[PDB]
Design a protein around this ligand. Sequence first.
Ligand code: HEM
Length: 110
Amino acid sequence: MVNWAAVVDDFYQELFKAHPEYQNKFGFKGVALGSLKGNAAYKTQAGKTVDYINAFIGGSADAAGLASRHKGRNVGSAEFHNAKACLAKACSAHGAPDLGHAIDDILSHL
Ligand code: HEM
């Protein structure tokens, strides 16, 4: 099993390093990046992100649903294009398969 939890941790490190303002939309707003792994809100959110990646690989991802929910947080195409870059770095850092197609599916509904 690819260590998707580790990939997602690296993903959020890249994401909030590049776009620290994105963190303000989450229950772990203002938490130092080096302490995220000890934050209960983050632990829940990272778990869901892992779940989505496993659902994509598994054939069950609902990209329309995920898209609609992100629009509900005023998160759109710009942000997801940024996330694509970050996720590609995280995957590559772990010798994991690239997830660009999953992000493209979400982007198709944004
Ligand atoms: C690699 C791209 C991303 C994936 C796979 C992803 C995945 C997810 C998942 C699975 C959820 C939970 C949805 C649910 O419970 O139904 C979520 C929620 C959320 N996402 Fe993302 N996301 C991505 C990018 C982003 C970006 C770039 C932002 C920018 C701020 C963002 C902001 C949020 C926020 C604010 C929530 C709600 C959190 C809460 O309930 O407190 N996401 N995301």
